[PDB]
Amino acid sequence: KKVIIAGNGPSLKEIDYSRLPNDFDVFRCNQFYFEDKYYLGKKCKAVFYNPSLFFEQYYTLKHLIQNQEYETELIMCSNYNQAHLENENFVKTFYDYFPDAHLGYDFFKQLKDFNAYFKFHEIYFNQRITSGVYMCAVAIALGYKEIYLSGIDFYQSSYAFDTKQKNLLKLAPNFSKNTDIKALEFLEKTYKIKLYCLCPNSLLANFIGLAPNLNSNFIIQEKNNYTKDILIPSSEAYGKFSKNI
Amino acid sequence: KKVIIAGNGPSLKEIDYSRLPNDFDVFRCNQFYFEDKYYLGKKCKAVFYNPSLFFEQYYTLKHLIQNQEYETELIMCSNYNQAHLENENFVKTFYDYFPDAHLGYDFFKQLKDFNAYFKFHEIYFNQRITSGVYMCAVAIALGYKEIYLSGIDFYQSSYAFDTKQKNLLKLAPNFSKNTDIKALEFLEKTYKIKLYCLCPNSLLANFIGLAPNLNSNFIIQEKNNYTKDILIPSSEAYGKFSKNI
Amino acid sequence: KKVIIAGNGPSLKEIDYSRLPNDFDVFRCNQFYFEDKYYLGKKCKAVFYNPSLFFEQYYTLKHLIQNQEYETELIMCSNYNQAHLENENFVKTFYDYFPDAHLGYDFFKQLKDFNAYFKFHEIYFNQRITSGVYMCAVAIALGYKEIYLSGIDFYQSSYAFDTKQKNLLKLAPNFSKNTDIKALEFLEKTYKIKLYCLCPNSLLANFIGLAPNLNSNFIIQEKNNYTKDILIPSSEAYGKFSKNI
Amino acid sequence: KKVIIAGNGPSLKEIDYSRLPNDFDVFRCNQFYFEDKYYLGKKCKAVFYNPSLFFEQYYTLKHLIQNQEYETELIMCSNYNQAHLENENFVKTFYDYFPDAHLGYDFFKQLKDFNAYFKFHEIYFNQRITSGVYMCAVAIALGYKEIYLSGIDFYQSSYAFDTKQKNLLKLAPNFSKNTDIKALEFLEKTYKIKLYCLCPNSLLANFIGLAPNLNSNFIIQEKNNYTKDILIPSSEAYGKFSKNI
Ligand SMILES: CC(=O)N[C@@H]1[C@@H](O[C@@H]2O[C@H](CO)[C@H](O)[C@H](O[C@]3(C(=O)O)C[C@H](O)[C@@H](NC(C)=O)[C@H]([C@H](O)[C@@H](O)CO)O3)[C@H]2O)[C@@H](O)[C@@H](CO)O[C@H]1O
Ligand SMILES: CC(=O)N[C@@H]1[C@@H](O[C@@H]2O[C@H](CO)[C@H](O)[C@H](O[C@]3(C(=O)O)C[C@H](O)[C@@H](NC(C)=O)[C@H]([C@H](O)[C@@H](O)CO)O3)[C@H]2O)[C@@H](O)[C@@H](CO)O[C@H]1O
Ligand SMILES: CC(=O)N[C@@H]1[C@@H](O[C@@H]2O[C@H](CO)[C@H](O)[C@H](O[C@]3(C(=O)O)C[C@H](O)[C@@H](NC(C)=O)[C@H]([C@H](O)[C@@H](O)CO)O3)[C@H]2O)[C@@H](O)[C@@H](CO)O[C@H]1O
Numbered sequence: 019k020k021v022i023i024a025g026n027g028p029s030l031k032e033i034d035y036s037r038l039p040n041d042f043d044v045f046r047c048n049q050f051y052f053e054d055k056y057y058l059g060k061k062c063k064a065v066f067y068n069p070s071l072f073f074e075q076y077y078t079l080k081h082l083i084q085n086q087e088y089e090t091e092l093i094m095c096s097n098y099n100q101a102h103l104e105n106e107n108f109v110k111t112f113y114d115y116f117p118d119a120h121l122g123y124d125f126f127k128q129l130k131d132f133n134a135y136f137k138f139h140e141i142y143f144n145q146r147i148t149s150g151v152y153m154c155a156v157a158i159a160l161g162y163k164e165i166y167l168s169g170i171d172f173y174q175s176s177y178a179f180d181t182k183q184k185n186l187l188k189l190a191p192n193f194s195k196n197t198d199i200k201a202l203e204f205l206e207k208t209y210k211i212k213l214y215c216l217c218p219n220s221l222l223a224n225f226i227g228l229a230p231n232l233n234s235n236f237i238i239q240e241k242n243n244y245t246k247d248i249l250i251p252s253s254e255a256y257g258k259f260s261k262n263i
Numbered sequence: 264k265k266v267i268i269a270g271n272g273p274s275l276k277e278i279d280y281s282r283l284p285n286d287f288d289v290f291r292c293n294q295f296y297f298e299d300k301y302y303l304g305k306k307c308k309a310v311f312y313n314p315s316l317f318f319e320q321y322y323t324l325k326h327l328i329q330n331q332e333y334e335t336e337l338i339m340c341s342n343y344n345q346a347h348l349e350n351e352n353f354v355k356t357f358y359d360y361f362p363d364a365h366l367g368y369d370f371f372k373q374l375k376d377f378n379a380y381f382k383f384h385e386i387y388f389n390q391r392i393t394s395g396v397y398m399c400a401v402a403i404a405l406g407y408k409e410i411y412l413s414g415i416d417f418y419q420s421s422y423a424f425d426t427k428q429k430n431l432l433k434l435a436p437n438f439s440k441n442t443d444i445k446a447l448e449f450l451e452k453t454y455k456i457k458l459y460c461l462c463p464n465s466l467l468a469n470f471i472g473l474a475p476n477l478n479s480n481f482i483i484q485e486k487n488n489y490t491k492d493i494l495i496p497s498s499e500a501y502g503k504f505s506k507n508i
Numbered sequence: 509k510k511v512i513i514a515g516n517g518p519s520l521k522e523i524d525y526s527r528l529p530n531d532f533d534v535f536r537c538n539q540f541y542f543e544d545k546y547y548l549g550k551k552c553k554a555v556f557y558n559p560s561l562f563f564e565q566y567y568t569l570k571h572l573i574q575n576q577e578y579e580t581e582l583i584m585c586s587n588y589n590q591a592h593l594e595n596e597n598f599v600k601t602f603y604d605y606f607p608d609a610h611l612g613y614d615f616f617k618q619l620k621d622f623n624a625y626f627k628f629h630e631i632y633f634n635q636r637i638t639s640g641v642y643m644c645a646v647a648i649a650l651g652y653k654e655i656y657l658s659g660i661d662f663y664q665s666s667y668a669f670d671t672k673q674k675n676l677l678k679l680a681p682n683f684s685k686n687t688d689i690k691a692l693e694f695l696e697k698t699y700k701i702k703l704y705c706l707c708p709n710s711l712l713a714n715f716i717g718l719a720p721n722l723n724s725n726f727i728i729q730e731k732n733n734y735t736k737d738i739l740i741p742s743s744e745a746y747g748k749f750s751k752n753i
Numbered sequence: 754k755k756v757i758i759a760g761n762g763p764s765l766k767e768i769d770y771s772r773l774p775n776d777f778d779v780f781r782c783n784q785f786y787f788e789d790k791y792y793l794g795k796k797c798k799a800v801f802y803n804p805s806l807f808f809e810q811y812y813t814l815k816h817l818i819q820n821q822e823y824e825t826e827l828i829m830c831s832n833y834n835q836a837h838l839e840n841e842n843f844v845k846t847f848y849d850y851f852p853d854a855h856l857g858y859d860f861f862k863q864l865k866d867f868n869a870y871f872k873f874h875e876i877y878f879n880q881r882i883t884s885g886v887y888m889c890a891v892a893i894a895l896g897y898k899e900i901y902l903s904g905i906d907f908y909q910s911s912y913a914f915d916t917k918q919k920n921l922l923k924l925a926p927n928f929s930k931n932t933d934i935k936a937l938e939f940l941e942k943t944y945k946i947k948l949y950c951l952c953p954n955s956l957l958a959n960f961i962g963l964a965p966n967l968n969s970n971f972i973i974q975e976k977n978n979y980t981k982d983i984l985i986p987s988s989e990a991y992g993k994f995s996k997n998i
């Protein structure tokens with residue numbers, strides 16, 4: 019079946035909606051909820067978060083669902099089983115702290131040839147795929163055959179929204195393209211799936227062919243008084259989770 | 264099949280016995296044996312104890328069985344796989360120290376949606392279900408469909424008995440309602456089971472409908488010269504178990 | 509099928525051979541090879557050694573087999589998964605250091621009720637079964653139905669041989685009955701097997717009925733120039749095994 | 754089916770090619786690529802590397818494949834699950850750092866009798882088989898029935914090539930026969946396979962019968978401007994792998 023995978027680059031705001039497939043699931047990641055409109059609707063099949071902020075993102079996502087801003091069926095942590103990248107205890111105890119979520123690596127590792135591809139480039143050449151590509155690998159492992167890409171701009175404005183929000187900055191004060199492109203080519207060739215681009219003005223469209231025009235319609239709902247920053251758990255909550263950070 | 268789940272609140276002494284089901288199993292917990300009469304009989308299907316006193320409670324239970332005060336088929340430890348709540352070595356080595364007992368979490372975790380529900384409230388909001396509710400989740404995991412509740416009073420006298428006994432005080436010198444009520448509602452709705460209340464005068468009866476009057480009979484046997492305090496193992500026994508405390 | 513289980517008490521020298529069963533396997537333990545005659549033949553189905561001397565006993569057994577003194581099909585370590593009794597790394601790495609041997613606990617633990625029985629008495633009352641009884645439990649787990657006992661004397665001369673040998677003393681300078689008797693009664697009743705005694709003059713014969721007289725014959729071969737002390741591995745070998753001691 | 758197993762001794766240069774089997778797979782190890790000609794072709798079924806240099810050898814092998822110098826289907830690490838021989842974290846995390854490779858021990862250990870044979874000699878007598886013999890055991894575990902040996906000379910010039918290369922010396926400045934011979938005899942007798950020698954002038958041919966002359970042909974391709982030293986990863990790569998070295 020068919021999936022739309024969305025990064026959070028500026029092209030998220032410039033999807034050509036006549037090229038949307040007839041039916042589909044949606045994958046989102048990281049600060050997706052910062053978007054000022056529902057560019058791909060409220061309903062997610064899966065959302066993906068990095069280990070470094072998973073504790074805060076899970077808490078924030080439960081707020082989004084309760085407040086009827088989004089829904090999702092799956093919740094994934096984008097990990098790799100690498101000591102230099104992730105806390106060992108966090109991975110070991112994951113299913114006991116977050117019983118309705120999944121370690122993304124449990125799916126990523128089912129693609130042996132791609133896992134090998136990723137590890138060689140990360141360890142020896144310091145070349146790492148982004149979340150956009152990570153989500154593609156997980157979709158392929160779950161059985162999707164046609165993947166439609168949006169919001170992937172290779173960092174050239176940084177984002178489809180203003181990302182410099184108070185709480186996020188408190189947690190992460192920090193707030194090439196070859197790596198992602200070669201990885202997508204490998205996935206397509208190795209696993210016999212099809213990639214499409216939904217964003218004609220994106221740099222991605224230079225490398226990946228456009229989804230065909232099907233005269234599809236889509237209503238873009240605007241958002242108001244919405245959650246536009248990550249939420250920060252209590253000091254007692256951090257105390258309980260402190261081995262895993 | 265049918266189960267009666269008993270906490271140790273004052274309502275344990277005020278069961279309406281005409282509402283007992285036609286056939287049933289009984290679950291008890293913690294200091295249940297402090298009761299001055301056999302309010303639910305001598306025969307237990309399962310008994311539940313917290314990790315913090317399991318070593319002493321297991322020793323005490325073997326005395327109760329040998330002395331013909333109670334019998335039980337199952338022995339459960341009420342754990343959650345949470346580092347802030349339980350000793351890691353205790354859980355790791357449990358089946359080798361207590362081969363005829365079970366970790367309650369081995370059953371609790373089979374209810375994925377409830378495990379997620381519990382963990383979110385405990386970790387982020389410092390809201391924890393009590394043993395009464397824990398036993399309900401385990402019963403549901405074991406296949407019970409009709410659950411009859413007693414001895415659940417939400418701590419307002421503290422107990423159906425005087426709990427301030429010498430040994431217990433030596434081990435634990437320490438000797439809201441929304442959390443338990445919302446959790447029971449979730450269990451009932453999610454797993455399609457039925458909850459009943461056996462205690463008409465209890466606060467519980469404001470939230471959970473009464474078991475129907477079936478004109479049942481029950482003989483309440485009085486107790487004499489009985490074990491009414493926890494027993495304390497030898498210093499040599501503590502020495503052997505010291506990694507797990 | 510039928511098994512003869514032998515301890516190393518003085519009664520090993522006073523078997524009534526007319527009571528030997530028509531066909532059988534033999535279990536031996538610890539310093540059995542110190543015997544001055546082949547009281548039960550050269551062929552063992554299994555030999556059992558304690559964790560504390562396993563490293564040296566395994567080395568010694570390979571010498572016995574090469575020198576054509578004994579043979580055995582199985583090699584067992586008599587462990588319990590108890591931190592106060594055995595080195596944790598020794599158990600964890602056992603199958604990689606001794607690939608043709610077994611941890612006895614892998615069989616012992618298949619008898620859940622007896623494992624529980626043993627652990628309760630050891631941990632809380634400092635009452636421990638001996639190797640003789642351990643071997644019985646393992647035989648029952650392996651499917652034996654009729655067990656014939658010898659060399660079990662409850663330590664009242666200590667042994668059927670002089671145990672005060674140079675190397676053994678170097679490794680272990682140290683070189684009641686109720687516990688073993690109650691444990692054997694439990695095994696017999698719980699698992700529905702039959703116990704017999706082969707040694708009419710033993711204290712054991714006061715508690716366990718004699719094997720029936722079948723007019724069987726047995727040739728007792730004498731031993732000469734034989735291995736009558738444990739062997740000590742090189743200092744380099746100890747260096748390699750030092751985490752496990 | 755049929756396999757040629759090659760060590761890197763001087764006899765690698767003196768194969769009698771009329772004795773090559775009609776069809777076959779090839780196993781190579783360690784510094785095989787230092788060879789000045791393709792003595793057994795470019796195509797390997799498997800290549801084997803020691804834990805001590807695996808990090809650098811894997812990196813080097815990926816270069817060889819990209820540069821079209823060799824190909825291989827399998828990549829094996831020649832380990833034994835022994836603390837004195839290999840880094841514990843290296844083994845624990847192996848499949849996550851090298852997803853397209855295998856721990857050789859996962860196959861070696863399938864030969865229980867040989868694993869026991871190896872461990873006894875290594876631990877107690879400081880007698881260790883070489884990589885040549887290790888590869889034979891792995892071939893047998895994978896189902897091969899006829900094994901053809903080359904490049905096994907028992908270290909008497911050291912090698913079929915000059916091994917004193919700059920990078921290798923930087924990583925390993927260090928750059929009897931009874932053990933290997935008795936181990937090969939054990940493998941042959943125990944697992945019912947056939948061993949042949951391809952090198953008539955080798956010391957091996959004194960102990961193992963020659964492969965029959967089949968009038969086979971083989972073209973020995975010369976090598977030019979080829980990789981003749983191990984490659985050294987960046988300091989950043991070592992930083993990431995530092996727990997495993
Ligand atoms: C991108 C980079 O290398 N940044 C360097 C910093 O490294 C980051 O350090 C963090 C410390 O908690 C985390 O370990 C980051 O690791 C993750 C993460 O964010 O959790 C691991 C994820 O698996 C990975 N996600 C994917 C899909 O690959 C993310 C991801 O790469 C992004 O967050 C990167 O923007 O990273 C880890 O990247 C740090 O060493 C500083 C030095 O102090 O240098 C930065 O250059
Ligand atoms: C209730 C509470 O938070 N009390 C606080 C103390 O926390 C207790 O500390 C104990 C130290 O050994 C245990 O870790 C207690 O944890 C358990 C337990 O009793 O073993 C874990 C059980 O899984 C849990 N049982 C259930 C069914 O949820 C029990 C249970 O919640 C009751 O025993 C609570 O009455 O707790 C742990 O609760 C401690 O931090 C002191 C500070 O020193 O503050 C108390 O407020
Ligand atoms: C018998 C006793 O309690 N002796 C006390 C000593 O305890 C011994 O300490 C040893 C130190 O390496 C071992 O841990 C002994 O544990 C075993 C063993 O010999 O390996 C564990 C075995 O599972 C057990 N075998 C069986 C079949 O039960 C043996 C066995 O009980 C006999 O070896 C006992 O004679 O023990 C452990 O028993 C030690 O604490 C000294 C104090 O320094 O006090 C002794 O009383």
Ligand SMILES: CC(=O)N[C@@H]1[C@@H](O[C@@H]2O[C@H](CO)[C@H](O)[C@H](O[C@]3(C(=O)O)C[C@H](O)[C@@H](NC(C)=O)[C@H]([C@H](O)[C@@H](O)CO)O3)[C@H]2O)[C@@H](O)[C@@H](CO)O[C@H]1O
Binds near residue numbers: 804831881
């Ligand atoms: C051969 C020997 O005993 N050399 C002694 C040194 O021991 C070497 O130390 C290394 C330190 O990183 C490694 O642990 C070597 O272990 C392996 C290896 O090279 O990785 C383990 C492999 O499984 C083994 N391979 C096979 C197929 O058996 C190799 C192999 O034996 C060869 O590399 C040996 O030439 O060894 C380990 O052997 C070291 O203790 C020095 C003292 O400082 O003394 C040397 O005699």
Ligand SMILES: Nc1cc[n+]([C@@H]2O[C@H](COP(=O)(O)O)[C@@H](O)[C@H]2O)c(=O)[nH]1
Binds near residue numbers: 026172173174175177
């Ligand atoms: N300018 C951008 C911002 C994000 N992306 C993609 O969106 C994904 C989510 O953004 P982030 O920076 O939070 O990882 C990111 O991993 C890339 O796949 C991009 O391609 N170009």
Ligand SMILES: Nc1cc[n+]([C@@H]2O[C@H](COP(=O)(O)O)[C@@H](O)[C@H]2O)c(=O)[nH]1
Binds near residue numbers: 271419421
């Ligand atoms: N006053 C009371 C005392 C106990 N209970 C219940 O009885 C259970 C056992 O009592 P305890 O305090 O030992 O956990 C407790 O977990 C609650 O479920 C109660 O509801 N009200």
Ligand SMILES: Nc1cc[n+]([C@@H]2O[C@H](COP(=O)(O)O)[C@@H](O)[C@H]2O)c(=O)[nH]1
Binds near residue numbers: 517538640661
């Ligand atoms: N005097 C003795 C000596 C040994 N035994 C038995 O022989 C077994 C082996 O002797 P040992 O002391 O090495 O554990 C021992 O465990 C007992 O089961 C005995 O019963 N009486």
Ligand SMILES: Nc1cc[n+]([C@@H]2O[C@H](COP(=O)(O)O)[C@@H](O)[C@H]2O)c(=O)[nH]1
Binds near residue numbers: 762763883908909910
């Ligand atoms: N002179 C030699 C060199 C190597 N070998 C064999 O070649 C194998 C690979 O060589 P190496 O030294 O890297 O382990 C080695 O393990 C032996 O099996 C040999 O037999 N004689």
